Amino acid sequence: LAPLFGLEQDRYMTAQIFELMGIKDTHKYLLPLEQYQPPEPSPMEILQLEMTKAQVENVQASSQKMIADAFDQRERTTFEQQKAADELSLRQEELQFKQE
Amino acid sequence: LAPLFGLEQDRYMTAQIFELMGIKDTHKYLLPLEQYQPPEPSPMEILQLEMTKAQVENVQASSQKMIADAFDQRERTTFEQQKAADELSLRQEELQFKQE
Amino acid sequence: MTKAQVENVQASSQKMIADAFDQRERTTFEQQKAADELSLRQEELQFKQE
């Protein structure tokens, strides 16, 4: 039932209790909800959110670096096959030279 | 209800209690809110915020270094393809030499 | 100690970009060497044709 028992309902309950016991409730710290501005968040949760964001971003960066190095190895194997083909062509050229 | 039960309301409540029991409240440590300056934050939370900022900045630095090395590997593969093309051109040059 | 730790954190953060720029300069130097090798290839072609 807390999702419905917001702030204004609790304030009205406490105010009714006071009226039953002490009438003037505005005389002190307690403020009429009409002029109660919301609290100003602190830098702690802000920097905590920033740290969590940086951590998840580093996680995604590592995840992408994995596939990056995978593609790098694939391209390196392709280049090695290319070098093998070039060496075969050079072998054929040397055969032509020897036969001439 | 705490967001409305600020400092001044609590001070008024305590002052009313005192008046009911002890009249002169200003005689001692308790100060009239009019001349109560806010507390001076300590270096502890400051250095903690600084450490959190440095940590998140290092996280972002690693995240960027990931893509940096990825682009480096991509450029290296491109350079390898360039070297393969150069070797093919040199093979054609050697073929021209042998045929001449 | 807290100051030294945060300073080391900033030092690592800067070293990251430092090594990044180093790799960039190394790739640039590799492209330069490739251009030099192409020029030497053209020189060898001139030699062979002469």
Numbering used by the authors:
A (entry chain J), B (entry chain K): 549 to 648
C (entry chain J): 599 to 648
Give sentences from the paper.
Escherichia coli phage SU10 belongs to the genus Kuravirus from the class Caudoviricetes of phages with short non-contractile tails. In contrast to other short-tailed phages, the tails of Kuraviruses elongate upon cell attachment. After binding to the host, SU10 tail, nozzle proteins, and short fibers re-arrange to form a nozzle that extends the tail.
The tail is attached to one of the vertices of the prolate capsid, where the dodecamer of portal proteins (gp6) replaces a pentamer of capsid proteins. Additional interactions between the portal and capsid are mediated by the wing domain’s stem loop. The stem domain connects the wing and clip domains and spans across the capsid shell. The clip domain of the portal complex reaches out from the capsid and enables the attachment of the adaptor proteins.
